[PDB]
């Protein structure tokens, strides 16, 4: 669950690719994939 | 067999009740 691409914003469960990283849609269950963005 | 509407042919190619097209009125 790495390979430098796919990676959930969570310590466990599965993994979500880089395309949904701070995009506005919530993908990983924890909701951390969208936490502390806005740069 | 072919008919008139609101001519054309249409036989049911299928061996079963349900497979048929829409009903008439």
């Amino acid at each position: 669950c790495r390979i430098h691409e796919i990676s959930c914003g969570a310590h466990s469960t599965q993994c979500i690719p880089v395309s949904w990283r701070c995009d506005g849609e919530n993908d990983c269950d924890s909701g951390e994939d969208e936490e502390n963005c806005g740069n | 067999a072919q008919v008139s509407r609101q001519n054309y042919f249409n036989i049911n190619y299928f061996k079963d009740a349900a497979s048929n097209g829409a009903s008439k009125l």
């Binding site: 690719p17 | 609101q6 079963d16 009740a17 349900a18 497979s19 048929n20 829409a22 009903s23 009125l25």
Partner: protein, 269 residues
Amino acid sequence: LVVPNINSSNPTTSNSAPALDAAETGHTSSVQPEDVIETRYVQTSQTRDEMSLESFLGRSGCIHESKLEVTLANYNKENFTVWAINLQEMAQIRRKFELFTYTRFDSEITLVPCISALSQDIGHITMQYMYVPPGAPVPNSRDDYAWQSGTNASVFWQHGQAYPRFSLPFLSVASAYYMFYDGYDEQDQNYGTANTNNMGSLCSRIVTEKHIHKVHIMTRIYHKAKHVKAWCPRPPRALEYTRAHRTNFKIEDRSIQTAIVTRPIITTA
């Protein structure tokens, strides 16, 4: 199927009043244009063909969206779905049929697969859909024997194959499907259409053996009714639907909202 025409009328001045009646009876006052206005003579063409039941429910709509997420690792232990069959899950449709108390008909089911790619490539995907009647064994693993389907009806779809489709005879053990049902269980429980409309379940499972690409399969389900009959019309629905097989409508901290628009005053619309 035609509509009568409108006959020319003339200035009556009779002792009989057809306009005046009494709705208390429960009948719809049978008055026609002519009786109330020196009218013309018209040869109407109009046709009610379209308004036939067969033309109404005679259109295919969607009733379910079954999303399946493939998971590399434990392949054979997941990557499969299940579904309680029913029309109760999709307003559009549901609202219509829920326009009559009882209905009878055959069905045309049509599938629509969509493979959302997650790796750079998709490879070769192949799905399977099995119809498991109530009583039949439900699958429990992408590799359960049940998928052998020695008798259940399954349909296979692979990538690049046109949408599949098939027909279904009127199921049920009655004369017609229950759209509503003021009754209970033999154990006085479950008030509702749920009490009957048990058609079994629909399952899918990716067939392609263990592989390399993570992907998402989204198969939508469409349904058209054929050869139809329906009884006892009911008033149409008025509020968003909340749950299957139940009429309930009150929702978590939100007003009861209809579709009736409001106005300032009634002497101006």
